């Protein structure tokens, strides 16, 4: 996260770290959506251009964390993966269209002050909140700058951007399964996700029921926090039918 701040304790209790077993290192962000299911970006698990194709046994998820590098004894919980599910139409070849994946845990994680699931949006909450100018919140342990790493989880609030502005900011083909967020050059404020934040949640707090909803997944960007560029996020609601199908079939 670039130009963000340290998270407060328990501020993002659905935050998940995807952790490589060997060598031991951060792979991505992710989010807890139930006691057995974790949501992330498909490119965190499968990205052939970079020779990335992880299997269940390659990975762990670490839940309840604040410190990036510490083993947070008595606070974090570490879970093994039962199965990875990647969207069948995930487009790793071109533009990361449908950049979404689910991971089922081998055993349920115990909820605590530091571990708690985020909501997934319904159609109405999505229609109400996914509007240009409305702000969401992105969290992660990724890079602090494009070209180091944070001691603890970082957070930044960013406004959703008008679709034509998103489109005009890049040569990459944008789809309805993406939205973009970030400040414009003329807005004076800054901030963005960066490498390492991939797969983490873009969340919004509904003013109707005071619950947090995950509207986006950190997907892609050209550089980090560049003027005139924006971060792009997987549109969770647009892909919710797939999410439900997987959970209904394999839950």
């Amino acid at each position: 996260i670039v130009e963000g701040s340290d998270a407060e304790i328990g501020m993002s209790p659905w935050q998940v770290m995807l952790f490589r077993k060997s060598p031991q290192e951060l792979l991505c962000g992710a989010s807890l959506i139930s006691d057995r299911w974790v949501l992330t970006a498909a490119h965190c698990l499968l990205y052939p251009p970079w020779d990335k194709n992880f299997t269940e046994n390659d990975l762990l998820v670490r839940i309840g964390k604040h410190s990036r590098t510490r083993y947070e004894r008595n606070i974090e919980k570490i879970s093994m993966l039962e199965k990875i599910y990647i969207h069948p139409r995930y487009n790793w070849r071109e533009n990361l269209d449908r950049d979404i994946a689910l991971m089922k845990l081998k055993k349920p994680v115990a909820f605590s002050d530091y571990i708690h699931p985020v909501c997934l949006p319904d159609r109405e909450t999505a229609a109400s909140l996914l509007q240009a100018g409305y702000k969401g919140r992105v969290t992660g342990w990724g890079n602090l700058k494009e070209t180091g790493q944070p001691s603890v989880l970082q957070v930044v609030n960013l406004p959703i951007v008008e679709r034509p502005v998103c489109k005009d900011s890049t040569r990459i083909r944008i789809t309805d399964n993406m939205f973009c967020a970030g400040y414009k050059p003329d807005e004076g404020k800054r901030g963005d996700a960066c490498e390492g934040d991939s797969g983490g949640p873009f969340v919004m707090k509904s003013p109707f029921n005071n619950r947090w909803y995950q509207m986006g997944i950190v997907s892609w960007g050209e550089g980090c926090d560049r003027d005139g560029k924006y971060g792009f996020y997987t549109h969770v609601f647009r892909l919710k039918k797939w999410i439900q199908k997987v959970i209904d079939q394999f839950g």
């Binding site: 952790f19 077993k21 031991q24 670490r62 570490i78």
Partner: peptide, 11 residues
């Protein structure tokens, strides 16, 4: 760099 995690999780 990362603090080693308990062995139980790497087995």
């Amino acid at each position: 760099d990362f603090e080693e995690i308990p062995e139980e999780y790497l087995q």
